[PDB]
Amino acid sequence: MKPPQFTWAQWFEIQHINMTSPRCTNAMRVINNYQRRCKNQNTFLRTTFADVVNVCGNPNITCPSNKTLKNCHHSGVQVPLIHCNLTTPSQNISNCRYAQTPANKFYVVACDNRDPRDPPQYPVVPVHLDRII
């Protein structure tokens, strides 16, 4: 899944922060081309990477998706988000059609120590979107 030219944190940014267009069909092509498959579902948080890093400093909690992981952090505040839902698949990635559903919700993110390629300014960085509450 994860392309090797990217860190975990940079891949989190591709998939869940940086929407290259306000519409899901357009926005998703970036992710799908790297994945070499049309993802069935994907959430974009309308927030900045630095804001998610501040959330990574909130007190650690158990990851809702996996009760044995403990590197998760609740956002404390709500952010707008857009959820992309695959409505027509294709063997041609550029023909994959998406519908979208906006929302304003809390989120829970999983965070890890930074890779040398991330900027030194962030010792801990987001690596997985665990749960949209």
In whole angstroms, how far apart are CA 55 and each of 8, 34, 36, 44, 80?
17, 27, 31, 16, 15
C-beta separation of 111 from 100 below 8 A = no
3-state SS assignment for residue 130: strand
Q: Residue 44 forms beta bridges with which residues?
A: 82
Rounded Cα distance between 76 and 82, Å, is 19
Which residues are part of the catalytic machinery?
Answer: 16, 128
Closest-CA residue to 10 (of 103, 80, 133, 112): 112
The first and second tokens of residue 7, run together, are: 């860190």
